[PDB]
């Protein structure tokens, strides 16, 4: 979508596996604020926004 009409997807009820996201090489920018990407596996979140 466009910038002024940016989409937002609700994420809930997941066994979230971020290892496949980390191991992919198609992303030029991979930056995280306050969370180590390798540590995303054990952590649990109440809700995730995309």
């Amino acid at each position: 979508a466009s910038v002024y009409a940016w989409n937002r997807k609700r994420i809930s009820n997941c066994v979230a596996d971020y290892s496949v996201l980390y191991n992919s090489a198609s992303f030029s920018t991979f930056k995280c604020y306050g969370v180590s990407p390798t540590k995303l596996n054990d952590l649990c979140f109440t809700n995730v926004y995309a």
């Binding site: 306050g34 969370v35 180590s36 390798t38 540590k39 054990d42 952590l43």
Partner: protein
């Protein structure tokens, strides 16, 4: 009301200890006030910050 000179001695110590305890719930600029979340959330290189 006669024993105030003895009661305030206890009161001061009880207040000082309570104030010392309440200081563990302060970020002091960090991202969290509890030491376990920082260790379980950040990589070892940048947890020391």
């Amino acid at each position: 009301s006669a024993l105030g000179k003895l009661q305030d001695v206890v009161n001061q110590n009880a207040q000082a200890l309570n104030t010392l305890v309440k200081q563990l719930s302060s970020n002091f600029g960090a991202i969290s006030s509890v030491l376990n979340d920082i260790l379980s959330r950040l990589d070892p290189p940048e947890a020391e910050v």
